[PDB]
Design a protein around this ligand. Structure first.
Ligand SMILES: CCOc1ccccc1Sc1ccc(-c2ccnc(N3CCN(C(C)=O)CC3)c2)cc1[N+](=O)[O-]
Length: 184
């Protein structure tokens, strides 16, 4: 069937210009590889607040990944992960914004630090959630574990820990090995 995938990327002040850019290039490569398929995308940047850089309707009309993420401004603030997810589940996955009712909802969270807010993400339970933690802020095992509550289970499947942003390329190569033409 169809798949509606949302990219929820970290825009905190911790992120260096080049690192932020590498997070955007990664998203584009994923989109480019899965173009002309039954996939539709939307990207949301989060820091203290949130902003939908482009929604499903925008993707359908434009398609070009580079153009959809050309006017992104690095927020350089905090990391309110909880509120961001909630925002995605109640303000992004909507028919008014090109979301398809039949589509399988997917969310790919990309962050470089522990959340600075608290709460719960119950509003997104019905969403398949992946999370990538990057950088030295996830040096200890305890810091990495804090991301488990945002991703689906098991953690070994929905939680990826990258020690450097350069490893995003390794992730993209590992991700492609899972691409298949399946009809039945
Ligand atoms: C290759 C393993 O990579 C990771 C491991 C843990 C956390 C994040 C990542 S990156 C990661 C992992 C998976 C996906 C991805 C892309 C398209 N579809 C799916 N599924 C959702 C719908 N499912 C259905 C149809 O039931 C099948 C799988 C997933 C994208 C990323 N990413 O872009 O970033």
């Amino acid at each position: 069937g169809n798949v509606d995938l949302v990219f929820l990327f970290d825009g905190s002040m911790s992120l260096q210009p080049d690192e932020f850019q590498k997070i955007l290039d990664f998203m584009k490569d994923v989109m480019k590889k899965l173009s002309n398929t039954s996939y539709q995308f939307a990207a949301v940047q989060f820091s203290t607040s949130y902003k939908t850089e482009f929604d499903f309707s925008d993707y359908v009309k434009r398609k070009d990944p580079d153009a959809l993420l050309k006017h992104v401004k690095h927020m350089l603030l905090l990391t309110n992960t909880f509120g961001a997810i909630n925002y995605v589940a109640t303000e992004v996955f909507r028919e008014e914004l090109g979301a398809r009712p039949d589509a399988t909802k997917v969310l790919i969270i990309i962050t470089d630090g522990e959340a600075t807010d608290s709460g719960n993400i119950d509003a997104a339970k019905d969403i398949i959630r992946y999370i990538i933690g990057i950088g030295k802020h996830f040096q200890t095992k305890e810091s990495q574990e804090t991301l488990h509550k945002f991703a689906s289970k098991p953690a070994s499947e929905f939680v990826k820990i990258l020690d450097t942003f350069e490893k995003l390329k390794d992730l993209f190569t590992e991700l492609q090995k899972k691409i298949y033409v399946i009809e039945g």
